[PDB]
Design an enzyme around this catalytic site. Structure first.
Site, PDB file in Angstrom:
ATOM      1  N   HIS A  61      -7.293   1.840   1.374  1.00  0.00           N
ATOM      2  CA  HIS A  61      -6.315   1.607   2.454  1.00  0.00           C
ATOM      3  C   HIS A  61      -6.150   2.864   3.307  1.00  0.00           C
ATOM      4  O   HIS A  61      -5.890   2.774   4.503  1.00  0.00           O
ATOM      5  CB  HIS A  61      -4.945   1.217   1.883  1.00  0.00           C
ATOM      6  CG  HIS A  61      -4.993   0.051   0.947  1.00  0.00           C
ATOM      7  ND1 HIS A  61      -5.316  -1.224   1.362  1.00  0.00           N
ATOM      8  CD2 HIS A  61      -4.778  -0.026  -0.386  1.00  0.00           C
ATOM      9  CE1 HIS A  61      -5.298  -2.040   0.321  1.00  0.00           C
ATOM     10  NE2 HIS A  61      -4.974  -1.338  -0.751  1.00  0.00           N
ATOM     11  N   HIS A  91      -0.799  11.251   2.921  1.00  0.00           N
ATOM     12  CA  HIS A  91      -1.857  10.410   3.462  1.00  0.00           C
ATOM     13  C   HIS A  91      -1.548  10.226   4.932  1.00  0.00           C
ATOM     14  O   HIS A  91      -0.489  10.639   5.408  1.00  0.00           O
ATOM     15  CB  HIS A  91      -1.910   9.034   2.777  1.00  0.00           C
ATOM     16  CG  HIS A  91      -0.625   8.275   2.865  1.00  0.00           C
ATOM     17  ND1 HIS A  91       0.440   8.466   2.013  1.00  0.00           N
ATOM     18  CD2 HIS A  91      -0.211   7.365   3.782  1.00  0.00           C
ATOM     19  CE1 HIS A  91       1.444   7.688   2.435  1.00  0.00           C
ATOM     20  NE2 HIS A  91       1.092   7.006   3.510  1.00  0.00           N
ATOM     21  N   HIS A  93      -2.150   7.481   8.577  1.00  0.00           N
ATOM     22  CA  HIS A  93      -2.384   6.158   9.146  1.00  0.00           C
ATOM     23  C   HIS A  93      -2.970   6.506  10.507  1.00  0.00           C
ATOM     24  O   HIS A  93      -2.474   7.417  11.178  1.00  0.00           O
ATOM     25  CB  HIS A  93      -1.082   5.384   9.320  1.00  0.00           C
ATOM     26  CG  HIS A  93      -0.371   5.136   8.028  1.00  0.00           C
ATOM     27  ND1 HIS A  93      -0.577   4.024   7.244  1.00  0.00           N
ATOM     28  CD2 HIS A  93       0.520   5.905   7.355  1.00  0.00           C
ATOM     29  CE1 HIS A  93       0.182   4.151   6.146  1.00  0.00           C
ATOM     30  NE2 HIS A  93       0.861   5.281   6.174  1.00  0.00           N
ATOM     31  N   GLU A 103       2.633   4.705  12.938  1.00  0.00           N
ATOM     32  CA  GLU A 103       3.446   3.602  12.448  1.00  0.00           C
ATOM     33  C   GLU A 103       4.780   3.667  13.172  1.00  0.00           C
ATOM     34  O   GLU A 103       5.189   2.694  13.809  1.00  0.00           O
ATOM     35  CB  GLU A 103       3.595   3.724  10.935  1.00  0.00           C
ATOM     36  CG  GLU A 103       2.245   3.541  10.253  1.00  0.00           C
ATOM     37  CD  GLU A 103       2.361   3.068   8.840  1.00  0.00           C
ATOM     38  OE1 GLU A 103       3.154   3.658   8.087  1.00  0.00           O
ATOM     39  OE2 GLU A 103       1.646   2.124   8.471  1.00  0.00           O
ATOM     40  N   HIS A 116       2.086  11.152   6.396  1.00  0.00           N
ATOM     41  CA  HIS A 116       3.200  10.864   5.502  1.00  0.00           C
ATOM     42  C   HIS A 116       3.120  11.752   4.273  1.00  0.00           C
ATOM     43  O   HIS A 116       2.189  11.601   3.473  1.00  0.00           O
ATOM     44  CB  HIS A 116       3.173   9.396   5.068  1.00  0.00           C
ATOM     45  CG  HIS A 116       3.520   8.458   6.179  1.00  0.00           C
ATOM     46  ND1 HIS A 116       3.238   7.110   6.120  1.00  0.00           N
ATOM     47  CD2 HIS A 116       4.133   8.737   7.359  1.00  0.00           C
ATOM     48  CE1 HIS A 116       3.686   6.606   7.255  1.00  0.00           C
ATOM     49  NE2 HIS A 116       4.233   7.549   8.037  1.00  0.00           N
ATOM     50  N   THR A 195       5.533   1.753   3.704  1.00  0.00           N
ATOM     51  CA  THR A 195       4.982   0.963   4.792  1.00  0.00           C
ATOM     52  C   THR A 195       3.771   0.130   4.425  1.00  0.00           C
ATOM     53  O   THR A 195       3.152  -0.473   5.301  1.00  0.00           O
ATOM     54  CB  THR A 195       4.665   1.805   6.032  1.00  0.00           C
ATOM     55  OG1 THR A 195       3.581   2.695   5.746  1.00  0.00           O
ATOM     56  CG2 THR A 195       5.907   2.598   6.472  1.00  0.00           C
TER      57      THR A 195
HETATM   58  S1  LIG Z   1       4.595   6.109   3.284  1.00  0.00           S
HETATM   59  C1  LIG Z   1       4.140   5.558   1.734  1.00  0.00           C
HETATM   60  N1  LIG Z   1       4.111   6.237   0.620  1.00  0.00           N
HETATM   61  C2  LIG Z   1       3.657   5.347  -0.364  1.00  0.00           C
HETATM   62  C3  LIG Z   1       3.422   5.510  -1.722  1.00  0.00           C
HETATM   63  C4  LIG Z   1       2.958   4.400  -2.419  1.00  0.00           C
HETATM   64  C5  LIG Z   1       2.739   3.180  -1.783  1.00  0.00           C
HETATM   65  C6  LIG Z   1       2.974   3.011  -0.427  1.00  0.00           C
HETATM   66  C7  LIG Z   1       3.431   4.127   0.246  1.00  0.00           C
HETATM   67  O1  LIG Z   1       3.743   4.254   1.594  1.00  0.00           O
HETATM   68 ZN   LIG Z   2       2.268   5.926   4.730  1.00  0.00          ZN
END
Ligand SMILES: S=c1[nH]c2ccccc2o1
Ligand SMILES: [Zn+2]
EC number: 4.2.1.1
Length: 257
Positions: A61, A91, A93, A103, A116, A195
């Site tokens: 993802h 991570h 997006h 986002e 994020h 998200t």
């Molecule tokens: S932002 C964000 N942090 C996350 C950690 C786990 C799963 C989804 C997520 O979305």
């Molecule tokens: Zn995220």
């Protein structure tokens, strides 16, 4: 089986995750003129000097840079938060085009990507327990615009070819996340959610006003990643962002002006 395709994308998530239509879903559009300055908000405290990065993983993802969160090392405190939140991973997006990818949006403006930095409240013991609490996580969101290169992001860009497909990981020790921050820590904050599924409503969102600049070559390399696993038809990892959700009964607060 959720993802970002026409068949399993954001518009489909509510079927397996009904909370997708909940009361505090993220991301949201940040209306700058409607966000109210809160003089009681304290400066944010981002203490990353002792951060211990470990690995970078393509999870199908996005890609996560993981940290050792078994001790108070890299932590976020202050701002709207009560307590200490430990950095567990970060991570991004991003989009298929520079005009989309973030986002959160600012006055409907979309940035090329959004970072994020995920942190969990130490009073809950572990991340799994924290996501079951309304104040379990604090995610620091930082916008990326295309312009000059971000030096502190290059080590990430350089390693992506080694984790091209879903399930691949690589050592990513000695990475300093301080190199991903903008100069200013002015921010907007509101109560929200993860998200991506499970879309749990456990996040205090802290979105920095100042975007960081990355080069076109840097984001281009993000777009060469794959959602698929090795030996499967290639599906470029692009547009892995959820669009803005209804603000509903929430107020976005500003730490500035
Ligand atoms: S932002 C964000 N942090 C996350 C950690 C786990 C799963 C989804 C997520 O979305
Ligand atoms: Zn995220």
């Amino acid at each position: 089986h959720w993802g970002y395709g026409k068949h399993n994308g954001p518009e489909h998530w509510h079927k397996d995750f009904p909370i997708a239509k909940g009361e505090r879903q993220s991301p949201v559009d940040i209306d700058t003129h409607t966000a109210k300055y809160d003089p009681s908000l304290k400066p944010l405290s981002v203490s990353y000097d002792q951060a211990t990065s470990l690995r970078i993983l393509n999870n199908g993802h996005a890609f996560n840079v993981e940290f050792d969160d078994s001790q108070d090392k890299a932590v976020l405190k202050g701002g709207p938060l009560d307590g200490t939140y430990r950095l567990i991973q970060f991570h991004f997006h991003w989009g298929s085009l520079d005009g989309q990818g973030s986002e959160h949006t600012v006055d409907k403006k979309k940035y090329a990507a959004e970072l994020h930095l995920v942190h969990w409240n130490t009073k809950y013991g572990d991340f799994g327990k924290a996501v079951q609490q309304p104040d379990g996580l604090a995610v620091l969101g930082i916008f990326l615009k295309v312009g000059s290169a971000k030096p502190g992001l290059q080590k990430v860009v350089d390693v992506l070819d080694s984790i091209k497909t879903k399930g691949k990981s690589a050592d990513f020790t000695n990475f300093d996340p301080r190199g991903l921050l903008p100069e200013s820590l002015d921010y907007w904050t509101y109560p929200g959610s993860l998200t991506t599924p499970p879309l749990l409503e456990c996040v205090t969102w802290i979105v920095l006003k100042e975007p960081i600049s990355v080069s076109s070559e840097q984001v281009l390399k993000f777009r060469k990643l794959n959602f698929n696993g090795e030996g499967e038809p290639e599906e470029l990892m692009v547009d892995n962002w959820r669009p803005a959700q209804p603000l509903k009964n929430r107020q976005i607060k500003a730490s500035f002006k």
